[PDB]
Amino acid sequence: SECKTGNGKNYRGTMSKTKNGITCQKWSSTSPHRPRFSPATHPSEGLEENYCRNPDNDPQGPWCYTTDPEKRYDYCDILEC
Numbered sequence: 024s025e026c027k028t029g030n031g032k033n034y035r036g037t038m039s040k041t042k043n044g045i046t047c048q049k050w051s052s053t054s055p056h057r058p059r060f061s062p063a064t065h066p067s068e069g070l071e072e073n074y075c076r077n078p079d080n081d082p083q084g085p086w087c088y089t090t091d092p093e094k095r096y097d098y099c100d101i102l103e104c
């Protein structure tokens with residue numbers, strides 16, 4: 024769905040920009056940021072492409088590692104189901 028419920032722990036939409044409009048980094052890349060959550064280690068968390076996800080159950084909801092090297096992560100703006 025292209026919307027989330029609660030903290031979006033199970034969100035599987037395609038939002039790929041942070042709330043500031045910055046392109047998310049691919050969960051499969053290690054640059055500029057080396058992830059703690061990536062597909063190999065977390066194959067059930069939907070860490071596909073550069074989509075915003077919540078593999079760590081952040082109460083603030085889905086987020087992504089960002090392409091900005093001075094911003095490791097940030098939240099995304101996701102529609103509420």
Ligand SMILES: O=c1cc([C@H]2CCN[C@@H](Cc3ccccc3)C2)o[nH]1
Pocket residue numbers: 058059060079081086095096
């Ligand atoms: O690899 C990573 C992922 C993160 C963020 C991801 C969003 N949830 C944050 C949860 C959080 C916020 C503040 C303090 C502790 C944990 C941790 O930081 N490094």
